[PDB]
Each structure stands twice: as C-alpha cells, then as structure tokens.
Amino acid sequence: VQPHVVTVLADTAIRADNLDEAAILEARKNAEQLLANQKSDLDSAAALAALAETAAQLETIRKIKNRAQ
Amino acid sequence: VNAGISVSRVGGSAQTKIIKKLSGGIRTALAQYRELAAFAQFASDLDEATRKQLEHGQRVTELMKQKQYAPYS
Amino acid sequence: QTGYKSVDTMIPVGRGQRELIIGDRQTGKTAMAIDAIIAQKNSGIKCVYVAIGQKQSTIANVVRKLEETGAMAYTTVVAAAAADPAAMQYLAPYSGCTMGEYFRDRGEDALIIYDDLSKQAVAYRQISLLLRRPPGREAYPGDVFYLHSRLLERASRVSAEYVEKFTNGAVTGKTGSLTALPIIETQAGDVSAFVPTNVISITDGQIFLETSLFNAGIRPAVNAGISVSRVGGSAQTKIIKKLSGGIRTALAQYRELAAFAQFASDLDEATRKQLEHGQRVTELMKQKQYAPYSIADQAVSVYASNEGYMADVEVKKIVDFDAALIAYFRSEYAPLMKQIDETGDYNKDIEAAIKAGIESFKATQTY
Amino acid sequence: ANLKEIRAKVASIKSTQKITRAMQMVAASKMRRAQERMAQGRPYADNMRRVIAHLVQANPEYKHRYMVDRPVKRVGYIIVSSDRGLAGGLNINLFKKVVQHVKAQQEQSIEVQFALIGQKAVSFFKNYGGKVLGATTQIGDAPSLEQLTGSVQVMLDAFDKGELDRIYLVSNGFVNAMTQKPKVEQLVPLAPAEEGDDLNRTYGWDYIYEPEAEELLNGLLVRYIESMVYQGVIENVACEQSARMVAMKAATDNAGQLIKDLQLIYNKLRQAAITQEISEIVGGAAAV
Amino acid sequence: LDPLVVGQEHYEIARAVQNVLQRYKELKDIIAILGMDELAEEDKLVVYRARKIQRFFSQPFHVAEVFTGAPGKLVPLKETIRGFKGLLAGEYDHIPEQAFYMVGGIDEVIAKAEKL
Amino acid sequence: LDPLVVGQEHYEIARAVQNVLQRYKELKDIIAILGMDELAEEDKLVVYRARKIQRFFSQPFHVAEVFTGAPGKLVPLKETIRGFKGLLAGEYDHIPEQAFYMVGGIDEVIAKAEKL
Amino acid sequence: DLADAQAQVKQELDAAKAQAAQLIEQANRRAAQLIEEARTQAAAEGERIRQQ
Amino acid sequence: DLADAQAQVKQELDAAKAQAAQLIEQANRRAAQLIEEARTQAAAEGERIRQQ
Ligand SMILES: Nc1ncnc2c1ncn2[C@@H]1O[C@H](COP(=O)(O)OP(=O)(O)OP(=O)(O)O)[C@@H](O)[C@H]1O
Numbered sequence A: 001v002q003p004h005v006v007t008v009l010a011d012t013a014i015r016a017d018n019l020d021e022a023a024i025l026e027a028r029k030n031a032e033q034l035l036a037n038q039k040s041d042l043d044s045a046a047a048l049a050a051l052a053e054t055a056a057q058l059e060t061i062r063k064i065k066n067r068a069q
Numbered sequence B: 001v002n003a004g005i006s007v008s009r010v011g012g013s014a015q016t017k018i019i020k021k022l023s024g025g026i027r028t029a030l031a032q033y034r035e036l037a038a039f040a041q042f043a044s045d046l047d048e049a050t051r052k053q054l055e056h057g058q059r060v061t062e063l064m065k066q067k068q069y070a071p072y073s
Numbered sequence C: 001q002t003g004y005k006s007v008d009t010m011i012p013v014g015r016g017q018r019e020l021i022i023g024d025r026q027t028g029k030t031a032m033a034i035d036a037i038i039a040q041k042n043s044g045i046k047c048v049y050v051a052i053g054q055k056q057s058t059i060a061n062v063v064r065k066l067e068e069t070g071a072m073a074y075t076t077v078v079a080a081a082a083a084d085p086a087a088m089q090y091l092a093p094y095s096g097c098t099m100g101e102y103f104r105d106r107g108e109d110a111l112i113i114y115d116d117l118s119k120q121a122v123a124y125r126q127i128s129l130l131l132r133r134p135p136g137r138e139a140y141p142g143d144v145f146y147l148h149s150r151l152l153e154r155a156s157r158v159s160a161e162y163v164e165k166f167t168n169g170a171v172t173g174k175t176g177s178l179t180a181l182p183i184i185e186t187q188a189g190d191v192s193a194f195v196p197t198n199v200i201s202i203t204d205g206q207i208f209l210e211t212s213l214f215n216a217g218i219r220p221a222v223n224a225g226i227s228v229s230r231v232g233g234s235a236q237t238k239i240i241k242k243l244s245g246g247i248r249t250a251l252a253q254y255r256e257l258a259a260f261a262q263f264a265s266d267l268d269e270a271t272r273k274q275l276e277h278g279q280r281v282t283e284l285m286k287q288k289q290y291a292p293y294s295i296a297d298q299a300v301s302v303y304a305s306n307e308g309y310m311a312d313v314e315v316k317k318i319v320d321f322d323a324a325l326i327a328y329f330r331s332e333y334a335p336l337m338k339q340i341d342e343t344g345d346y347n348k349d350i351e352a353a354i355k356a357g358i359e360s361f362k363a364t365q366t367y
Numbered sequence D: 001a002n003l004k005e006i007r008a009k010v011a012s013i014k015s016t017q018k019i020t021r022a023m024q025m026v027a028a029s030k031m032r033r034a035q036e037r038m039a040q041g042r043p044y045a046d047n048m049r050r051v052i053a054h055l056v057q058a059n060p061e062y063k064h065r066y067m068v069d070r071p072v073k074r075v076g077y078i079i080v081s082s083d084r085g086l087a088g089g090l091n092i093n094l095f096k097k098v099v100q101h102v103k104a105q106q107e108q109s110i111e112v113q114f115a116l117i118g119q120k121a122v123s124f125f126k127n128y129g130g131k132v133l134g135a136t137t138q139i140g141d142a143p144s145l146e147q148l149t150g151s152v153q154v155m156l157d158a159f160d161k162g163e164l165d166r167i168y169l170v171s172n173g174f175v176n177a178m179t180q181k182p183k184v185e186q187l188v189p190l191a192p193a194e195e196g197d198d199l200n201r202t203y204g205w206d207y208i209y210e211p212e213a214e215e216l217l218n219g220l221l222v223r224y225i226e227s228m229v230y231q232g233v234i235e236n237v238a239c240e241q242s243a244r245m246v247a248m249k250a251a252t253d254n255a256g257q258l259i260k261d262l263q264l265i266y267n268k269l270r271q272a273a274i275t276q277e278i279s280e281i282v283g284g285a286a287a288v
Numbered sequence E, F: 001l002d003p004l005v006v007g008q009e010h011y012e013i014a015r016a017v018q019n020v021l022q023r024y025k026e027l028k029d030i031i032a033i034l035g036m037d038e039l040a041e042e043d044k045l046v047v048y049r050a051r052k053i054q055r056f057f058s059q060p061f062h063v064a065e066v067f068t069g070a071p072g073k074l075v076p077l078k079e080t081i082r083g084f085k086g087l088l089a090g091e092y093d094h095i096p097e098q099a100f101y102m103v104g105g106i107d108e109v110i111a112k113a114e115k116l
Numbered sequence G, H: 001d002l003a004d005a006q007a008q009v010k011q012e013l014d015a016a017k018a019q020a021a022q023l024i025e026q027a028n029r030r031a032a033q034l035i036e037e038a039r040t041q042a043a044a045e046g047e048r049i050r051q052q
C-alpha cells in the first residue's frame, strides 16, 4: 500500500464471495483442459495422418516414370 | 515373400493338425503389423500396446528369415 | 424448369438449349431426366424419351412410374433395348429428333432426352468396323464427332419468321423450339476420353455428377463446382434471376473454405458465421426424386435463405424446417404462390407478403 | 497403367495441402492469443521487483540464500518443451544447446540436475538419463501455476540443501514474430541486475513489516521465481506456435511442388498409353 | 434399396447402419494413434454398437455339414429389423459384443449373454 | 518483349511493373494470414501502388458506350508510359485508388482525383 | 405491486388459453382439408385405373 | 419476482400443447393416404372384376 496506490500480488484470487465459488474456477480450468485435449485431437489427427499417407505409395510411381510399355 | 497378397484357396485343409493350430496368431500379427505400416516411422507418440504389436511383428518378421538350401523339418 | 433449386438457380435452362448431364454410373442420371420430364404438368410442352440399350425391366419400370404420374399423355417414348439390332439403336436418336422437329416446325416448344449416346456410339463403332472401314483411335471412325454433332444441332429455338414461312401463313405468332438433354456415362469420372471430349464442345452447358456425394447420401449428388450453363440468367424467371446470387456467392465461399469443418474452435467469428451459412445452404439442396419444387417453393426457400431466418436453426432439421414452411404457405397463402407461378415477378409487395408469412410461421407452429 | 489411382493420389495431396493451410491459420490465431498472454504478466513482476528493491535498499544488512553466490558444485536445469512435435526444430536446437552446455560444465567437474517439462524433452533426456528429479506433461496452452508448483518447489528445496548451486531456465526466447532462439539462463543465483540499477535514492518512507522481514522476503523470492518460470513457459509456447506455423507453410509448398511433378508424369504416361493402344489397333486392323 | 419397395423403416435402418459403420471406420486411425479416452464420450457408444453389429452379422451356416454343426438361421427379415432397430437405439448397448457373435436374433443374443 | 523492340526505357518499365505485380502477389498470402501491419512500410507502399496499378489497367471501351453508356477512351503510348513511370516514382501516393478505375490517361486520372 | 403482478398473471394465462385455442383449431382445420383433398385426388386415380 | 418467473412456465406449456397439434396433424394426415392406398387396391379389385 502507498498513500495513493494499493495493490495485491495474488497467489490466486477470483472475483467471488466465498470459496463456494470454487465450483466456478474449475469451469475455466476444465474449459482450458478441453482445449488442451482438442489441440492434440486435431494436431495428430490432421498432421500425422495425412502426411503419413502422402509419401506412402509414391515410390511405385517414381519408378515407372519412363515406361514405354 | 509378400504375405499381403499371396494366398491359397485350399487353406489349412492341406495342413496337419499342429501347424494349422499354430498359424493363426502368426497371421493375425502379420496383419496387424501390415496395418500400422504408414506410422511405422513415428514410434514416439502412438499407443504403447500398438508399440507392443509392432515389436511382435518385427520379431516374427525376423523369424521368417532363412538361408538357402536349408529346409526345416 | 426442373424442380431442382440448385439446377434452376446455378444452371438455368432455356427453351431450345443443349445442356449435358454427365457423370459416372448408377448416379440417378436416368432419375434426373425423368424427374425433369415430370415437371411438365403446366409447361404445355411435349416430351420424348429415347432409351438405348436398356433392360426391358428398367424400361417397363419407367413406363409404369410415368403412367402413375399420368404424364404419359403429352409424352411419347421409344427405346432401343439391349436386345435389338445395332442399326436400330444407331438410328433411333435421329428418329426421336425427327418427332421433336415435327412440333418444333409446328411452332411448338418441346423437350427430348437421349440415353447413353456413348452406347449408340459403341453400336456405330461396331457397325462401321464390320464394314471394314479404316478404324480410328480406340477403333472409333472419325465421323463420330460429325455423327453426334449433326444430331445435336437439329434441336434449338427457331426464329418465328422461319415458323411463319414454313407454315405458309398457317401460324404466325409463336416460335418453335426444342431443348436437348443428352446423357453421357463416364469411366471413373474421366473427361479426357475421346467421346466425352467430343461431346463437351458441342453442348451449351454441362452438368456433372459426383459419386462421393451420393455415396455421402447427398441426394442429388450434383457438383456445382464445375457444372455450368453459359446461357446466363436469360433462362431464369425475373425473381429467380434476382435471388440466385446469394446462393452463388455463399456456395462459392463455402467451397473454397469448407475445410474448416472440424476447425474454427479458435478462428474469427465471421468465418464461423459464414461457415454455418454455407453448411445450411449446402444441405438445403438435398432432395428426393418425384418431388419437384414449384418455382414458388424454390422462391420461398431462397428468400428464407438470404433472409437468414434459417441462420438460427440447427442443421439437422433444415429439411424439416423447409417442408413445414412449404406446407404452411401452401395452405395459408395459396393465392400468393398462385400469382407467383402465374408470373414469377419480384415485387416489394410480394416480398413483404412473403416475409410476413415467414415470420408468422416462425411465430406460429414450430418445426 | 492405373492412372485413376494416380489422380486419386493427386486429390489426396490437394486435400492435405488445404489441411496444412488450416493448420497455419489455427497456428496464427494461437500465436496471437499467446502473444497477448505474454504482456499480462508484466505488472506483477514489475511492482514486485520494485518492492524487493525497496526492501534491499532499505535492508542491506544481510542477504538471502537466493541473493548469495557460493562456488558451484552441482546445477539444476529446467527445460520446457511441447507435448507434441511438428513445430520446427525448436526442441532440436534446444537440445543441441543444452547438451553442449552440459558437456562444457562436466569438464568443470560439476554435476547437472533436471526437472522436465514437455513429453518430447521428457523422452529426449530419459533415454540419455541424467540426474533428473522432476517430470511434467499435459501443460496445455494455459497451465496453472499449481502445475509448475511441485517442480519449482523441488528445485527450491534442492537449492536449500546446497547440492544445487546454479539453476538455469531453459526455454526459447521469442525473438520476433517469425524467428525465436533457445535461451538458457541461470535464475536461482541472482546478482544485482536492475536490482542494483534503475534506482537513484532510498526512500525515507518505508513499510512496516507485520511479519518478519526475513520470512516475508523469502516468500517474495518464492513468488518471483515462480512467476519467472510461468512467463518463460508462456513465451516458449508462443515460440512453438510460430515454428508449427512455419512448418505447415513449408509443407503446403512441398505439396504444391509434388503436385506439379505428378501432373507432368501423368501427362507423359497418358500420351504413352494412347500411343501403345493405337499402335495395337492399327496393327490388328492391318492384319486383315 | 428403396423405401417404396422395401418400406421406410427398413430403408432408414439400413441408412443409419451405413452411417455408423462408415463413421467408425474413419476413426480407426486416430483411435490407434491416441486411444478411446481422448475421443469425446460421443462415438464411444458408436464404437461399441459397430462392434456389436459386426458380431450380429456372424451367421452360422445351415449347410457346411462341418463348420459349426451346420445350423440354419434363416431368421425373418422382421425379427432382424427389430434387433437392429434396438441396437441402433441402444436397447442392448450395455452387453459385450461377444454375446452378439455367431448368433441370430435378440433371443439368441440375450440367452447367450445370460448363460455366460 | 525486348529492349531492342519496345526500346530501352519501355522495356525496363515493363519489367519493373512485372516485378511489382509479382512482389505483391506473394505479399497477398501474408496479408491474408498474418495481418497487414506486421510488414515493412515499403512493402505496404508496394501494396498500395500495385493496387493502383490493377485499378488502372482497366478502361472504358468505345464498344462499351452502347452497352452501358460511359463512352470509351482511346489512348496511345507515351502517355501510358509516362503515367506508369510516374506511378512507379510514387509521386501519386497521395490519391485513392478510385481515380484509376474506369478511366483513360493519367491526365484524366488526376482530373478525377482533383474532382474526387 | 404484488396485486398488480397477480392481475398480470391472469392477464397472461388467459392469452395463453386463447392462443392454445387458435393453434389447435388451425391444426384441426388444416388436417381435415388435407384429408379431403387427398381422397379426392386418389378418386381421380381410381377412375383412371378403371379406364386403363 | 417468483410470480413473474412463474408466468413463463405457462408459455412453455402452451408450446407443448402446440407441439402435440403437430402430432395429431401428422397422425390423421397419414390416415388420408391410408384410405388412398386401401381403396386404390379396391380400384385394383374393380380391375380384376374387369379381368374376370
Ligand atoms: N433424391 C433421391 N432420393 C431417393 N432415392 C433416389 C434419389 N435419386 C435417385 N434415387 C435412387 O437411386 C437409384 C439409382 O439411380 P439410377 O438407376 O437412375 O442411376 P443410373 O445412373 O440411371 O443407373 P445406370 O447407370 O445403370 O443407368 C434409383 O433407383 C432411385 O430410386
């Protein structure tokens, strides 16, 4: 506190009336948790898969390039 | 041999009891390993059980090696 | 008119135009033709169906279905089934063209449909081959281009002056016309095959069918992304000519950026709203056979689309929403749609009445 | 030949290209979000350094174990990595820097200790081994300081034993919106660096210390270190986002190149097939 | 496959089973990559139902003379409609798929599930 | 397209225009994805100048006169050349893109710009 | 204000009943009209069948 | 405050009543084509009378 500015460096605080509002902080907690699930659920599923099939069967083409018969 | 495409319509009917009894899980493991071919180069983020299946497939794959002129009873 | 909102919006079809349905196999192409035929309860035109190399079972099924519709009264059909002399099959489309030209030269307007011009081309190939003629690429005598082209151009919309002079004074007012709707079946959706390649430069516009969409249950399975009609809006009614653009641009935007289906959990909101708009309007065209939409029906659907009054309802019931709206107007406001399809004009009074009915429906019974 | 399969391969590659484009856009949005997230942590550390400086300038009579520096016998290291790869080579060059530094230190006969964050680095150092005592994953884009708290306390107590003498934060500095560099900086040993600077007077006014100034300062140092760790985590997450974005762009470009390649070869093959078949036909017809 | 010739209910059941099976197929890869848990609770029941469908399809042959005893099933279309309708609804989406294996109608499935 | 054909200065001018239009084209994707104000202000100048270029290359047509009114404008070289060169000099970076749209020579463009 | 609220409660319940009547009569009428038109068209179908 | 919240319940009840209306509409509308099909068969019965 200063005669003109006061502040609190919060270890953890929530705009709330009581610890009963713990039912509210977990809402954002699990929200970000769900997002953390989502980032993987897309990342590997999109990137790893499609890129896996990309280079997969290309060889049989590159070997038959100059085929005259 | 490429087991992915080579087959016989005859089937185990021309095999003795014991070998037909055994070949099943072998074929299954080969099918599993063939299934996960596209991801074989990424054994860092897959399932552990899938890794076990891949390791089993690797071992049985090496088991299918043999020399020449050296047949087996 | 085709009774197909996508068709009648993005692919207008004018009396006397050559337009091509094309696609791979078992894609309802036959169904597309016959349903287009059905919509001619009020057009006053006549119609001819040409069937080539078909199973008499299929032929008879089509016959029976048409009879159920009763439309086999301003209609005539000839079929060169698969159990027929090749020459019969080869000549048949020309005969159908002859019957069409009869009425066309009577100043009348009509519609005709071919079946498997590829098949009759095959028959002609075989015939020519048996004549020891010099073969061409894929055994095809060159005149196949000439063969088809000399057929297709025989159908068009004529100058009424030609009508008058041919009639020698018998008729003076109308102008004859004949619209050509051929069908080509393709191998794995290729367009580079010689015969289709020949066909393409002939028609005034083409329509593709994509297997995956029907496999995805998209009924009908038309890919508007490549299907075009270079005749412009001149083949639409004024109101549809007005209201097509919204669908045009929304479907565009969607098809460039539809990839985000599973995405847009972090993307900007405008993209999400436009995606929902696109998904809804895309679903809108899913349609069943033998259920033609009157232009008034299409009109109310497009109005509800562009008014965004479906931009607030879940996608899974859009079809239900539409059907309910359809019945609601059909009952409540029959004279309005009566007048509409009498004329097909866009007026502020008209749109105000339509919007009032829509907002009533939303206010009234739910879907 | 099976040309339709070739066309299908082309279509699949096109789809993959669009998916990469989506990857890039999502990465951009995440980048902006995290870039916002960085700035919010400033005032905490700002005011807290201010008051810690006010304290030390008010009380220079003694120091703290986190303020002191004795000769180093062992060190602890904290490295932050993703749960999933594909985001450039940030983990790669990070590991290169850390391994060369550790080799530089072991020839100084000082042991190295670790607590791990991020599955990739977790594996990367488990296989190597090392003197690791902490390991964490499932951090997410907005972790809780709670999640870091166990590890950070582990380092705290280990430092209290005097076993560990320097502790270096290992992360990747967000140099700019496109390029970022690894950073390994000691933090538990602190020296006056803006702690003896940015000041010009000791305020004749001071606060009264309701608890003991010693324990109060100790708790302070706790919070300050934890906040430093937290913001470093934020920054390296943003860097991950950048690297992933760039890699997706490059993937799209390579896809386009391969598309050109395949299309050209397809044209050649179609020509050849047409030639072969027409030759067959003309020979067969010439047979009669 | 047309409602006018097969009725509506059978047609729509076929539609739904097509949808569920094809959706289960396309999730195989990601399931392999991560596992069932990381998927939303949605489609877990879908996976179970698809597996039970596959089991339900296992039909002991009437005439092999030696494959499982040559038992005929020739179950009525209506009974199978009933069973698949219940399975799509989830009437029995609480039983191991094995109970649906190598059998016919719901009666056999329930009897097998109870005997084990 | 050779300095031995259209002359030296004309050739270089055209090459410079091509460079600008390319440069902006590869700019487009970054403008789309990573915003706009995250780039060199010179690059932004390039963007504006290229936009002016594109706005300018279209023109009214004497055939368009009967179509939609708006009688077309005939324009030879040595004015197009000069106007484009001046645009490349950036001496017109104080004007909205509109003055370049549906218009003849640079004199007309400045007339509109003053009148706009 | 509570007395006013009670009066409002009645003022809403009566209108609820009224709109209920409106909707139900509309549905009944529409359905009857539909069954009417239906069997008339099916009668056209039957006579044409006999003519066949 | 509670009474005001309570009026809203009545609107939901009215909506449910309106929803039933659609049930009855569909149910009896079905009966129309039921009759249509059945005596369409009766037309077929006149037909095989004609065939005799
Ligand atoms: N919108 C729709 N809703 C429901 N069923 C449909 C729809 N469109 C088509 N069908 C059904 O799809 C079936 C197959 O279509 P159709 O036989 O016309 O394909 P096709 O290409 O003509 O076949 P072929 O290639 O053998 O000539 C038809 O029997 C029809 O009943």
Ligand SMILES: [Mg+2]
Residues within 6 Å of the ligand: C029, C030
């Ligand atoms: Mg057909």
